Design a protein around this ligand. Structure first.
Ligand code: NAD
Ligand code: NAD
Ligand code: UFG
Ligand code: UFG
Ligand code: NA
Ligand code: NA
Ligand code: NA
Ligand code: NA
Ligand code: NA
Ligand code: NA
Lengths: 338, 338
């Protein structure tokens, strides 16, 4: 199929693009480069084994979106583009709402204009809000995200839902991601955050590479087995694979298809640290700090639905997640070149 | 004060403008005329007793918004502009999200740019969602609106809230309206809907004027005193007055000030019909029809807070609401001239 991948040069999108190309689809990447570099493109094509077309631009530019859609005869759109720094979203809400809410709105508006009716959206477990019931299941009603980022994600899910209702021929997949980590097995592609990493894995990696002193473990008094926070980590490659499958199986299948994409099990901060220490051959330095604002104690996904309906499940392990990250970090300590 | 009134040529905004001018404020009206006519302007100035400046344009045009803000040294913005047809919102969701969500977003973004930090937003009781507890009180957590229109209103309330948190110097009033009806006492200004009126009062008026046959009373088996739906109707003039007061008292008072604006009592469909029959001197024709999709049985506002904090309460009666509407309808059967 002909697919437009917004945010295609980013972490998750890049890996998805590679998997998409491997499956012989025709890929058009649309990215504004606010959080990625052009230097990833050649890697995508190399690892993907096929050339993806790249367009530098913004999802907020409806006219351009419409043009691309028509120009490339797109069949389906995978929408990864947007801003995702939780803390920053609290400090700069408007940017979040603009890029995520308006951004998606402009994009689907262009789709309507170009008669494109297959969409895949990068959603988040954040949409479940403060749910005491875990694991999280797609049948649970959504709650109230605590950050503007989280809220922006739920708002889009809602707008998408109403759109489908009004344009019942659309097939829209709401893919709720858990905690993506890992890197391509080659070690030549991976997450390349700029500045201080907000997420656990990359932070650990940076500590391991010798860039940072010690990992601050946010909280050690949680009602969990070891006192640290518990989450569902999923290898970016599994996530990527899930996207391809969802795209292939849901295209032209009318409805709003919601799926949690996670491993279906939780691991604590310590579990993650331990796996990394093992992967990098040295104990990762760390210390306990106070709980981080808005952090939930423990949650993970119930990924039965995706298994059942899409025959998709993760296949990479936590160790792999850690090994792959280390390999990329270690092979490319400066990330992608300017 | 210097105030920008978006949607100023519309139903609620026009009346507010008149009251604003009467209080000697400097008014700049910004409206795209998608749901009003220029012919109201002269009436506003006449009844307002002072000239308001008019700018034809769209809230979605951030650059223009910014310009107006700076050009007129605006101190505070009253935001009435947007789309409000509930049923249509279900059929055309994107337009609602664009005009309301993005629309407001562009506007407050311009405000930020122009350093304007006092805002008043036209909200709705819809934000309470399906609340069994009535009357509705500002302390209740919001629920889930059933239409894209309702959702759009709640989304903005949320975006506004996060914005204030990030820009704590802002004063933002979330004015939750109930069911606005009535017209200026002169009978020369009032609601001028195009096509089939979606709301009760104007529909009744059109039946009374001889334009329509009979009023369809949506449902007669509700768990109410007479079986018909119960709502809190508030005279547009009271609503207008509330806006002036809120503007004057909350300006430069940091925070998110939420107030329900309603009479604080409910009236059924029959109560309304009866008042109108009385006002127009003839029995209004009507019949019972099935319940309308998404209609709640009964609700009204608890308006104690606004009384307490702003010393504001309604002063017009239901009879007045009906009389005033009839007078306008009867004096201007074709509404405002093209
Ligand atoms: N990584 C996570 O932990 C996490 C979990 C939940 C959800 N998500 C979502 O998944 C998607 C992918 O996240 P990711 O980790 O790959 O992030 P990323 O930042 O690496 O990828 C996002 C890409 O979007 C681009 N972009 C941003 N705003 C744009 C705009 N307006 N126009 C065009 N391009 C724009 C960025 O340049 C970047 O390449 C995002 O929507 C994110 O919110 C990721
Ligand atoms: N009337 C009600 O029953 C009801 C109750 C709840 C909330 N509200 C809200 O109060 C506000 C006023 O409603 P109203 O009854 O006066 O409606 P209205 O349609 O008479 O007034 C809205 C005005 O906004 C203008 N407008 C619309 N979109 C615009 C845009 N993008 N740019 C610029 N101008 C634009 C229209 O031309 C119109 O003059 C609206 O936000 C409405 O959602 C009203
Ligand atoms: O330096 C760090 C980073 C993380 N953690 C801990 O490691 C776990 C994972 O934290 P991350 O920041 O990597 O990821 P989150 O669980 O916070 O992210 C989730 O919650 C966010 C807020 O709801 C959403 F934005 C997002 O989509 C979702 O994946 C948490 O228990 C966190 O407290 C640390 O101890 N130290
Ligand atoms: O032709 C009509 C019109 C209305 N009604 C009844 O009159 C009452 C008032 O109906 P309106 O349409 O005038 O107004 P609503 O109560 O439906 O409006 C409210 O509910 C909407 C949906 O939540 C919101 F969009 C909006 O902001 C809010 O004022 C309801 O019981 C309705 O069923 C009739 O019987 N016949
Ligand atoms: Na429809
Ligand atoms: Na960064
Ligand atoms: Na670098
Ligand atoms: Na802040
Ligand atoms: Na109309
Ligand atoms: Na007319």
């Amino acid at each position: 199929m002909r697919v437009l991948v917004t945010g295609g040069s980013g972490y998750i999108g890049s890996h998805t693009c590679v998997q998409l190309l491997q499956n012989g689809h025709d890929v058009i990447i649309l990215d504004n480069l606010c959080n990625s570099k052009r230097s990833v493109l050649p890697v995508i094509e190399r690892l993907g084994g096929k050339h993806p077309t790249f367009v530098e631009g913004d999802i907020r530019n409806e006219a351009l979106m419409t043009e691309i859609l028509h120009d490339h005869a797109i069949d389906t759109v995978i929408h990864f583009a947007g801003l995702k720094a939780v803390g920053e979203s609290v400090q700069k809400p408007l940017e979040y709402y603009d890029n995520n809410v308006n951004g998606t709105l402009r994009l689907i508006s262009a789709m309507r204009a170009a008669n494109v009716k297959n969409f895949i959206f990068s959603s988040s477990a954040t949409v479940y809000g403060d749910n005491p019931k875990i694991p999280y299941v797609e049948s649970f009603p959504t709650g109230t995200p605590q950050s503007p980022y989280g809220k922006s994600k739920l708002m889009v899910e809602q707008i998408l839902t109403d759109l489908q209702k009004a344009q019942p021929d659309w097939s829209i997949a709401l893919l709720r991601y858990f905690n993506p980590v890992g890197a391509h097995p080659s070690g030549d592609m991976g997450e390349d955050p700029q500045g201080i990493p907000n997420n656990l894995m990359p932070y650990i990696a940076q500590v391991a590479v010798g860039r940072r002193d010690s990992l601050a473990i946010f909280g050690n008094d949680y009602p969990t087995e070891d006192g640290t926070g518990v989450r569902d980590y999923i290898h970016v490659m599994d996530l990527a694979d899930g996207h391809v499958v969802a795209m292939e199986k849901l295209a032209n299948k009318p409805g709003v298809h919601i799926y949690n994409l996670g491993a279906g099990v939780g691991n604590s901060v310590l579990d993650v640290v331990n796996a990394f220490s093992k992967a990098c051959g040295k104990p990762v330095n760390y210390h306990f700090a106070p709980r981080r604002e808005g952090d939930l104690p423990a949650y993970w996904a119930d990924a039965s639905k995706a298994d059942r309906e899409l025959n998709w499940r993760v296949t990479r392990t936590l160790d792999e997640m850690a090994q792959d990250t280390w390999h990329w970090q270690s092979r490319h300590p400066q990330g992608y070149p300017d």
